[PDB]
Amino acid sequence: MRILLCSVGTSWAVVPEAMQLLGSQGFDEVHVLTTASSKISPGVEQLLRYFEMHPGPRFSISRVQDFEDLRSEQDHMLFEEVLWRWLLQRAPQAAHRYICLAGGYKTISAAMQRAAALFGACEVFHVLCEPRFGPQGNREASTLEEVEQAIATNALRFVRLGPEPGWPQLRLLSAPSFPLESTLQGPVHWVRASDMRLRQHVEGVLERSRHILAAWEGISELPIPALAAWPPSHLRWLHEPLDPVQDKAWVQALPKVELHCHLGGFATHGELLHKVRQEAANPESLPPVRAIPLPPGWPIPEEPIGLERYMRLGDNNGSALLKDPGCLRAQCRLLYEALLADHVAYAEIRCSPANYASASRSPWVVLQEIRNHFQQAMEETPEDRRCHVNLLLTATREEGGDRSRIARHLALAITAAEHWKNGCRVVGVDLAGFEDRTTRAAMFATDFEPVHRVGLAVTVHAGENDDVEGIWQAVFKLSARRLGHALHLSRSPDLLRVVAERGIAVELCPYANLQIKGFPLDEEQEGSETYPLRGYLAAGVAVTLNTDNLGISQASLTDNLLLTARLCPGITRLEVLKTQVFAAQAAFANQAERKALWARLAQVPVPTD
Amino acid sequence: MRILLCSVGTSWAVVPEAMQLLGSQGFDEVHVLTTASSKISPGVEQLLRYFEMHPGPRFSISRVQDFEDLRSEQDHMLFEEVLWRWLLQRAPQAAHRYICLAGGYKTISAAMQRAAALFGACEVFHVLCEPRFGPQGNREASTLEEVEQAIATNALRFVRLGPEPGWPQLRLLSAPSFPLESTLQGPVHWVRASDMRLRQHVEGVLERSRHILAAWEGISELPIPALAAWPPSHLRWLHEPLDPVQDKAWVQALPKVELHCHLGGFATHGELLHKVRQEAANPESLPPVRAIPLPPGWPIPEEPIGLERYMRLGDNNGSALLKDPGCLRAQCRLLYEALLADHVAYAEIRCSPANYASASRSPWVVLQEIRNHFQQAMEETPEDRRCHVNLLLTATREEGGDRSRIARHLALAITAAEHWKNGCRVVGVDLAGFEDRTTRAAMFATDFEPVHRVGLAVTVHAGENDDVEGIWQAVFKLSARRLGHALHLSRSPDLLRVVAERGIAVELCPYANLQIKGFPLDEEQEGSETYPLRGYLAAGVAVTLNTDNLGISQASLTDNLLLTARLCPGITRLEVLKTQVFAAQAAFANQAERKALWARLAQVPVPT
Ligand SMILES: [Zn+2]
Ligand SMILES: [Zn+2]
C-alpha cells in the first residue's frame, strides 16, 4: 500500500529516520536506491543491520552498477533513468509513493523531486533530526544507537511538500514496458539500466509540452487523444502499412467494436456446433447434422460462392437448433465467450427471436431469454474485461414483406426497448431483405415512426447490388443510421458525399464480402474492382469493420481486420484505429455505454517493435 | 532581461559558480536570498566582495530577518512565503527566471524547486563543482581565489533540470499584491513577510486543483488531440471554471466556428450601420435612419424583450437596406472583417437572396454577388488567418404567404449547390420560422428530397417557443441535421436522447437567447430556469454556441462564449473547446473545408 523510497546519496541514517513519518502505522513496502560507492558500503551494511533488527515492512536496497559518483549532466541522466526504472518497478501504482527528498549528496534530491513531479506521488517530504546527537551532542544522528535515540524521545520533524500527482502521459508507463535488470549479488539488489528509453519517452512527452508550433500538425488529426502521448516512433509505426502476419498480436490485443454479428451464424460447424448441440434441453427432438461441405479453401475460397450458398452453409444452426432453449442458451454463452476471447469491448448482436420461436416459446420469451443469457454473461465478467452486448432485431425473409410479420417485429422491438435500460438491451432493428423489391416496398410502406420515437435506430443490408436509389431511400425515408456492406457507394460520388457528410456508417465485412462477392487479394495497386475500404476512408465515410456470421465465415473480428492489408494494399494501422473509432461513434449506445466503450478504446495496445 | 536566483547556506561559492551558466556574457541582473544564521554571515560578506570588478548589472543579496535554522515545517512555511514574495519581486516574469538549486541547506533547495513549478522558470538548474580538486585535491573548489581559479579552469558542471511553465493560476500574482519589507543595513536586505497571505492563496489554489484533478484525470476526454500535449498544469487549468473577466483574452484568441449568423442582422446600428450606408451606390434611395431605442442595459436587459421586439430592433438594416448593391457589398466585407477580428476559422452565413432582390436584380444575382464578395474576401487574406465562409439560404415566408416562395428558395439552393464547388458554397437551407403551424405545415407538404440529393443539408429554427412534435418532424421527416435554439429539449427526455444519439446539433445563441427569452445570470448554482447548455452537454447533445444576429445582439462570438460563464454556473474552458469541436463536427463542410478547419482548430492558445 504505502511505499517509501528515500534514495540514499550518503548518510544511511536518513532512511530509518524517514520510516517514522507515519508513526505507529508503518510503511508497508520499503525500497532504497543508492550509489554503489565504497563509502556507502558501511552505510548499506548498517541499513541491513537496522532492517534485520526491526522486522515488519518489506526491505530492499538497490545499488546502481557502474555508477560511483554523480559528476556531470550525463552521470545525472544515467541515475535519472535508473531512478525512473526502479521507481516504476518498485512502486507500480501511480499514487502509492511517499518520496523522500533527504539524502542527496549531488543533485540526487533534485532529480528525485523531479521524478516525483514527472511520474507522481502522494507525499514528497523531507526529514529533519534535531542536532542534539553525536559524540558531543552537536550534530545529527549518524549511528544505529544515535538513530534509535532519534526515533525514541521524538526529535524528528517532517517537512511534507505535497502529493505532486504527476504527468498524466507518463503515468501510463509501467515496469513491464521498461524492464530493469537486477542482480541479487547478496542481500542487496544491484540495478543497471540497459537503454535510455524511459528518459527519451519522458523528454519527448515534455518537448511537445512546451512546443507550440512544432507540436501542431505533428500530432493533430490523430483519431485517439491517447495516441498523442505515444512516442514519435510509435506514431510513425501507426502511419505504416498493416502486416497481416506480424501485426496479428497487435490486432488481437486491440479493443474492438462489433456492430454486425448475427446470432444464428456462430456455431454452424465444427466443435461449437456440437457443443450447442449437446447443451440441448431435449436431445431427441434435435435435427440431424446435415452434411454441409465447406467450399475448398475456406475461409478464403478460390471463387466467390454467392449469397444463397453462403446462407445454406449455416443450415445446421439457426432455426434448426435455437428453438430449443438449451441450444439457445449454449449459443448465447459461447458467442459471448467468443466475443470475450477477441477483445471485443462493445458488441451489437443481431438476432431474430421469431426464427427461434417455438410453439411453447413465443418470440418475446425467446428475446427475453437471449437478453438474460447475455446479461448474465456480462454480469459474470469484470468491468475492465467485459463486453457490452446490445441486441438488434432482424427482419428476414427475402421476397415478401407480409405486413403481419413487420408489425409483430417492430412491436416486439418497441416493447423490448422500454423493458430494459441497463446492461443488455434492444437498441434497434435490422432490415434484411432490402436486396429485393417486394420486401423493400413493404419496408418503405411500413411506419417506422414508433421505432424512431422509442429511441430505436435502423440498419439496412446495403450495396450487395449496385442500387443507389435503395441507399437513398433507406437514408432519408427510413432514417437508417448504418448501412450493411454497401460495397458500391464509390460509383456515385454524390451518394458518397451525402453518406460521408451525414455521418452514416458503412458496415464492411472483409472475409464475408470476399467469400460472397469476391475481391482482389495481395494486389500491388488499387485498381477498379478492389475492395472499397480505402476509397471510403478517403471519402470521409464512417467505415466499420465487422463480421457477419462468426461460424459461416469461420473467422473472428481480428482476422477480419487482418485481411484489410490483403484486400486494400497499403492500409495503415492508424486506419484500423480510425475504423475502430468510427465503429464506436456509430454504435447505438447510450451515454454510459459510450463512455465505457471510449474508456476501453483509450487502452490501445503498445506496439512491441 | 534574464534573472538569476540562488539560495545560500554555509556554501557561498554556489552563486559565483552559478553565474557561469552563460560564460563571459553573464546575466543582465542577479539577486541572492539567504538566511540570518551567524554561520552564513561571513559568506554574505565574501559574496559582497566577490563583485566590484563587473560594472553594469547590480547584484543584490537578501537575508530573512529572524531565521536561524529551518528545524520544523513551521519555519519552512514562513521561509516559503518570504521566498515566493522575493521571487515575485526580484523575478517578475517566468520567461527570464533562472532558479539556482545549489546552496540548499536543509529544505531550501526543495523549496526553491517547488517555487519553480508553481510560479514558473525558464531554467531550473543545479551547479556541481566536480572535480573536488581543492587544497590537496579532496574538496570542492569553494571560498576565495579557489572559486575564480575554478571559473578559469571549468570544473563547473551545470545540471539543467529543464524549464518550468508554472501554474497558469499562479502567474497572475504580482509583487505589489503581496509586498515584502526591505530593511536595508547597507548593501544587504533583511526582507521579511508581513502576513502569510501569498501562501494561503497558493495552498487554496492547489487544494481546489487537487479536488479537480481527481474527477478530471486523463487525456482521453480532450476533444482536441493537440490538448493531450499540454503540461499538467495547463490541462488542469483547462478543467477549471471559465472566468468571464480574466479569460477574455484567451477566448478572444481561440479559433472559433460560426454556424448561425444572419447576414441581415450584422450592421444593425451604430458605426457599422453608418459605414454600410455610406457605401451605398444610390444614397438618394437610402431609407431614413429609424429611431430604434435599444432596451436599457443592452446588450444585457434586465427583462426579456421578446422575439417581435428583437426583430424590430434590426429594422434599419436588412431587407430595406441591402437591396442596394453597394450596401450588400459593404455588408459582406464588414461581416468578413468581423469574422476575421474574432479569430473565426469557419462560418456559415444565413441569407435570404430573394429578400434583397429588385426589379433588375434577381435572387440568383443577389446570391451570386454575396458568394463572390465572400470569395474575394477569403482570397485577400492569408490562408493561416483565412476564415472559410459557406452560405445557408433562409426559407422564411409570410403569414398566409406562398408555397411558390419556398419552391423558388429550394430551387435556388439546388442550383447554387451545383454552380459552386470551391471556396464559398451554398451548403444548406435554413427553414426559418417553423414556430407557427401555418408555415410549419407547408414545410412538411414540400418535397425536400431534391434538397437531400444535391447534398444540401437542412437546419430549422425549432425549439424556441414551439412544440417538440415539430422537433420530431424536423429530425425524421425533414432530415434536419441541426436545430436552431431549441432551449426546451430537456423537458422531454426521449427527444433529448434521440437528439444526443443521432448527433443532431443544437444551435444555442447565448446573447440572443438572453435578450429574447429570460435566463438567470450569475446564479452560481443550477436551477429550473437555468440556461440548458450544461444539461445539453451532459446529456451528450452536440451543442454549438452561435451569435444569431451580430448587430441586433450587439455581441461577437467571443462575447457569446464568455456569456455562458454567467448563464451556466461552473462552465469550464474545456467545455468551450467542446462546443467549438461540436461546431466543427456539425458544420455542413466537405472534406477540404473540414480538414482546414481541424488544422486551424488544433491551434489552441496557451493561457497566460
Ligand atoms: Zn448480414
Ligand atoms: Zn435564426
Short mmCIF file of N, CA and C in Angstrom, two decimals, chain A residues 378-465:
data_model
loop_
_atom_site.label_atom_id
_atom_site.label_comp_id
_atom_site.label_asym_id
_atom_site.label_seq_id
_atom_site.Cartn_x
_atom_site.Cartn_y
_atom_site.Cartn_z
N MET A 378 -22.39 -10.93 -19.14
CA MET A 378 -21.71 -9.68 -18.83
C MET A 378 -21.57 -9.48 -17.32
N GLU A 379 -22.58 -9.88 -16.55
CA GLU A 379 -22.54 -9.68 -15.10
C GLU A 379 -21.53 -10.61 -14.43
N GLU A 380 -21.21 -11.73 -15.07
CA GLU A 380 -20.16 -12.63 -14.58
C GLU A 380 -18.77 -12.19 -14.99
N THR A 381 -18.63 -11.01 -15.60
CA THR A 381 -17.37 -10.59 -16.18
C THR A 381 -16.89 -9.31 -15.50
N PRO A 382 -15.60 -9.20 -15.19
CA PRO A 382 -15.04 -7.96 -14.65
C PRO A 382 -15.22 -6.78 -15.59
N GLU A 383 -15.35 -5.57 -15.04
CA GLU A 383 -15.75 -4.43 -15.86
C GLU A 383 -14.64 -3.98 -16.82
N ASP A 384 -13.36 -4.13 -16.46
CA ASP A 384 -12.34 -3.97 -17.49
C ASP A 384 -11.96 -5.30 -18.13
N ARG A 385 -12.94 -6.15 -18.41
CA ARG A 385 -12.72 -7.29 -19.29
C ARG A 385 -14.02 -7.48 -20.06
N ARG A 386 -15.05 -6.76 -19.62
CA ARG A 386 -16.42 -7.00 -20.07
C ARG A 386 -16.67 -6.52 -21.49
N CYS A 387 -17.49 -7.28 -22.21
CA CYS A 387 -18.04 -6.87 -23.50
C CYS A 387 -19.50 -6.49 -23.29
N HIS A 388 -19.84 -5.25 -23.62
CA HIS A 388 -21.24 -4.83 -23.55
C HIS A 388 -21.96 -5.32 -24.79
N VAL A 389 -22.83 -6.31 -24.62
CA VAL A 389 -23.63 -6.84 -25.72
C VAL A 389 -24.97 -6.12 -25.74
N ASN A 390 -25.25 -5.42 -26.83
CA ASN A 390 -26.57 -4.90 -27.13
C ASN A 390 -27.20 -5.77 -28.21
N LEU A 391 -28.52 -5.66 -28.35
CA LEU A 391 -29.25 -6.53 -29.26
C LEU A 391 -29.97 -5.73 -30.34
N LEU A 392 -29.92 -6.27 -31.55
CA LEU A 392 -30.69 -5.77 -32.68
C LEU A 392 -31.64 -6.86 -33.14
N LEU A 393 -32.80 -6.45 -33.63
CA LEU A 393 -33.80 -7.39 -34.12
C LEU A 393 -33.88 -7.30 -35.63
N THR A 394 -33.85 -8.46 -36.29
CA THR A 394 -33.68 -8.55 -37.74
C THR A 394 -35.00 -8.87 -38.42
N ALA A 395 -35.25 -8.23 -39.56
CA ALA A 395 -36.41 -8.51 -40.40
C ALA A 395 -35.94 -9.26 -41.64
N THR A 396 -36.15 -10.58 -41.65
CA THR A 396 -35.65 -11.52 -42.65
C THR A 396 -36.61 -11.73 -43.81
N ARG A 397 -36.49 -12.88 -44.48
CA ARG A 397 -37.43 -13.40 -45.49
C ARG A 397 -37.52 -12.57 -46.77
N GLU A 398 -36.47 -12.66 -47.58
CA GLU A 398 -36.48 -12.09 -48.92
C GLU A 398 -37.74 -12.49 -49.68
N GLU A 399 -38.12 -11.65 -50.65
CA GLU A 399 -39.30 -11.86 -51.49
C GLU A 399 -40.59 -11.92 -50.68
N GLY A 400 -40.92 -10.83 -50.00
CA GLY A 400 -42.25 -10.60 -49.48
C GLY A 400 -42.27 -10.11 -48.04
N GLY A 401 -42.73 -8.88 -47.86
CA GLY A 401 -42.88 -8.28 -46.55
C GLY A 401 -44.29 -8.36 -46.00
N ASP A 402 -44.78 -9.57 -45.72
CA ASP A 402 -46.13 -9.71 -45.17
C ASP A 402 -46.29 -8.81 -43.95
N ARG A 403 -47.28 -7.93 -44.02
CA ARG A 403 -47.44 -6.82 -43.08
C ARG A 403 -47.65 -7.29 -41.64
N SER A 404 -48.03 -8.55 -41.47
CA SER A 404 -48.23 -9.11 -40.14
C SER A 404 -46.92 -9.38 -39.41
N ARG A 405 -45.85 -9.69 -40.14
CA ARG A 405 -44.57 -10.02 -39.53
C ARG A 405 -43.79 -8.78 -39.12
N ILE A 406 -43.80 -7.74 -39.96
CA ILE A 406 -43.12 -6.50 -39.61
C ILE A 406 -43.80 -5.85 -38.41
N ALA A 407 -45.13 -5.88 -38.37
CA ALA A 407 -45.86 -5.32 -37.24
C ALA A 407 -45.53 -6.07 -35.95
N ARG A 408 -45.44 -7.39 -36.02
CA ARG A 408 -45.03 -8.17 -34.86
C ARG A 408 -43.58 -7.88 -34.49
N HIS A 409 -42.72 -7.71 -35.50
CA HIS A 409 -41.30 -7.48 -35.25
C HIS A 409 -41.05 -6.12 -34.62
N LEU A 410 -41.63 -5.07 -35.20
CA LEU A 410 -41.41 -3.72 -34.69
C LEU A 410 -42.07 -3.53 -33.33
N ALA A 411 -43.24 -4.13 -33.12
CA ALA A 411 -43.88 -4.05 -31.81
C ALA A 411 -43.05 -4.75 -30.75
N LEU A 412 -42.48 -5.90 -31.07
CA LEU A 412 -41.58 -6.59 -30.14
C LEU A 412 -40.36 -5.73 -29.84
N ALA A 413 -39.80 -5.10 -30.87
CA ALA A 413 -38.65 -4.23 -30.69
C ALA A 413 -38.98 -3.05 -29.78
N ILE A 414 -40.17 -2.47 -29.95
CA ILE A 414 -40.58 -1.32 -29.15
C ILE A 414 -40.83 -1.74 -27.71
N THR A 415 -41.49 -2.88 -27.51
CA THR A 415 -41.72 -3.38 -26.15
C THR A 415 -40.41 -3.70 -25.45
N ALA A 416 -39.46 -4.31 -26.17
CA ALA A 416 -38.18 -4.64 -25.57
C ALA A 416 -37.32 -3.41 -25.34
N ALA A 417 -37.53 -2.35 -26.13
CA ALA A 417 -36.77 -1.12 -25.96
C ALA A 417 -37.05 -0.48 -24.61
N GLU A 418 -38.31 -0.53 -24.17
CA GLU A 418 -38.72 0.08 -22.92
C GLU A 418 -38.66 -0.87 -21.73
N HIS A 419 -38.37 -2.15 -21.96
CA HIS A 419 -38.32 -3.13 -20.88
C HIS A 419 -37.00 -3.07 -20.11
N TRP A 420 -35.91 -2.74 -20.79
CA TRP A 420 -34.57 -2.74 -20.21
C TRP A 420 -33.89 -1.41 -20.48
N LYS A 421 -33.26 -0.85 -19.45
CA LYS A 421 -32.48 0.38 -19.57
C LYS A 421 -31.00 0.19 -19.25
N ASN A 422 -30.63 -0.93 -18.63
CA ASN A 422 -29.25 -1.16 -18.22
C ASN A 422 -28.80 -2.52 -18.72
N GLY A 423 -27.48 -2.66 -18.88
CA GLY A 423 -26.93 -3.88 -19.39
C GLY A 423 -27.39 -4.14 -20.81
N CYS A 424 -27.60 -5.42 -21.12
CA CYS A 424 -28.05 -5.80 -22.45
C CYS A 424 -29.46 -5.28 -22.69
N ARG A 425 -29.64 -4.61 -23.82
CA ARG A 425 -30.94 -4.07 -24.18
C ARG A 425 -31.04 -3.99 -25.69
N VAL A 426 -32.26 -3.91 -26.18
CA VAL A 426 -32.54 -3.80 -27.61
C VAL A 426 -32.41 -2.34 -28.01
N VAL A 427 -31.59 -2.08 -29.03
CA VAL A 427 -31.23 -0.71 -29.37
C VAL A 427 -31.61 -0.36 -30.80
N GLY A 428 -32.13 -1.32 -31.54
CA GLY A 428 -32.52 -1.02 -32.90
C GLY A 428 -33.07 -2.24 -33.61
N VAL A 429 -33.39 -2.03 -34.88
CA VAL A 429 -33.91 -3.07 -35.76
C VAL A 429 -33.03 -3.14 -36.99
N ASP A 430 -32.79 -4.36 -37.47
CA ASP A 430 -32.05 -4.58 -38.70
C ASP A 430 -33.03 -5.00 -39.79
N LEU A 431 -32.97 -4.33 -40.93
CA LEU A 431 -33.89 -4.58 -42.03
C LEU A 431 -33.17 -5.37 -43.11
N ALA A 432 -33.27 -6.69 -43.04
CA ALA A 432 -32.79 -7.58 -44.08
C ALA A 432 -33.88 -7.75 -45.14
N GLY A 433 -33.52 -8.41 -46.23
CA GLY A 433 -34.39 -8.49 -47.38
C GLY A 433 -34.43 -7.20 -48.18
N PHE A 434 -33.60 -6.23 -47.82
CA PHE A 434 -33.57 -4.95 -48.51
C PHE A 434 -33.14 -5.09 -49.96
N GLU A 435 -32.47 -6.19 -50.31
CA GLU A 435 -31.97 -6.53 -51.64
C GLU A 435 -33.07 -7.11 -52.56
N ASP A 436 -34.34 -6.92 -52.21
CA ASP A 436 -35.47 -7.29 -53.05
C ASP A 436 -36.26 -6.02 -53.41
N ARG A 437 -37.42 -6.20 -54.05
CA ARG A 437 -38.28 -5.07 -54.37
C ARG A 437 -39.61 -5.18 -53.64
N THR A 438 -40.13 -6.40 -53.47
CA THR A 438 -41.36 -6.57 -52.72
C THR A 438 -41.14 -6.31 -51.23
N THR A 439 -40.11 -6.94 -50.66
CA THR A 439 -39.79 -6.71 -49.25
C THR A 439 -39.36 -5.26 -49.03
N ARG A 440 -38.60 -4.70 -49.97
CA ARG A 440 -38.19 -3.30 -49.90
C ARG A 440 -39.37 -2.34 -49.96
N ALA A 441 -40.35 -2.61 -50.82
CA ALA A 441 -41.56 -1.80 -50.88
C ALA A 441 -42.37 -1.93 -49.59
N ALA A 442 -42.41 -3.13 -49.02
CA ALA A 442 -43.08 -3.31 -47.74
C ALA A 442 -42.37 -2.53 -46.63
N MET A 443 -41.04 -2.51 -46.64
CA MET A 443 -40.30 -1.72 -45.66
C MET A 443 -40.61 -0.24 -45.80
N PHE A 444 -40.58 0.29 -47.03
CA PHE A 444 -40.90 1.70 -47.21
C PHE A 444 -42.37 2.03 -47.02
N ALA A 445 -43.25 1.03 -47.07
CA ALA A 445 -44.66 1.25 -46.75
C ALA A 445 -44.96 1.08 -45.27
N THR A 446 -44.00 0.59 -44.49
CA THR A 446 -44.19 0.43 -43.06
C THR A 446 -43.85 1.72 -42.33
N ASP A 447 -44.64 2.05 -41.31
CA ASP A 447 -44.40 3.23 -40.49
C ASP A 447 -43.37 2.88 -39.42
N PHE A 448 -42.20 3.51 -39.51
CA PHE A 448 -41.14 3.33 -38.53
C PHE A 448 -41.12 4.45 -37.50
N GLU A 449 -42.15 5.28 -37.48
CA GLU A 449 -42.19 6.40 -36.54
C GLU A 449 -42.22 5.96 -35.08
N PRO A 450 -42.99 4.95 -34.66
CA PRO A 450 -42.85 4.48 -33.27
C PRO A 450 -41.45 4.00 -32.94
N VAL A 451 -40.79 3.35 -33.90
CA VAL A 451 -39.41 2.92 -33.71
C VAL A 451 -38.51 4.12 -33.45
N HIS A 452 -38.69 5.18 -34.23
CA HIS A 452 -37.89 6.39 -34.05
C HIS A 452 -38.21 7.08 -32.73
N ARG A 453 -39.48 7.05 -32.32
CA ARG A 453 -39.88 7.71 -31.08
C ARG A 453 -39.30 7.02 -29.86
N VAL A 454 -39.31 5.68 -29.84
CA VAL A 454 -38.85 4.97 -28.66
C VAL A 454 -37.33 4.97 -28.53
N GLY A 455 -36.61 5.47 -29.52
CA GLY A 455 -35.16 5.52 -29.47
C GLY A 455 -34.44 4.43 -30.23
N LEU A 456 -35.15 3.59 -30.96
CA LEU A 456 -34.52 2.55 -31.76
C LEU A 456 -33.99 3.11 -33.06
N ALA A 457 -32.76 2.73 -33.39
CA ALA A 457 -32.16 3.11 -34.66
C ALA A 457 -32.37 2.00 -35.68
N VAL A 458 -31.94 2.25 -36.91
CA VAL A 458 -32.22 1.37 -38.04
C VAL A 458 -30.93 1.10 -38.80
N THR A 459 -30.72 -0.16 -39.17
CA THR A 459 -29.67 -0.57 -40.09
C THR A 459 -30.29 -1.31 -41.26
N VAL A 460 -29.61 -1.30 -42.40
CA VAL A 460 -30.07 -1.97 -43.61
C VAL A 460 -28.91 -2.72 -44.24
N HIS A 461 -29.22 -3.86 -44.86
CA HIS A 461 -28.25 -4.58 -45.69
C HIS A 461 -28.16 -3.89 -47.05
N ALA A 462 -26.99 -3.36 -47.38
CA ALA A 462 -26.85 -2.43 -48.49
C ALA A 462 -25.72 -2.85 -49.43
N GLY A 463 -25.83 -2.39 -50.67
CA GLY A 463 -24.72 -2.44 -51.61
C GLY A 463 -24.32 -3.80 -52.12
N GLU A 464 -25.06 -4.86 -51.76
CA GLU A 464 -24.83 -6.15 -52.39
C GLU A 464 -25.11 -6.06 -53.88
N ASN A 465 -26.19 -5.37 -54.24
CA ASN A 465 -26.43 -4.94 -55.61
C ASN A 465 -26.20 -3.44 -55.72
#
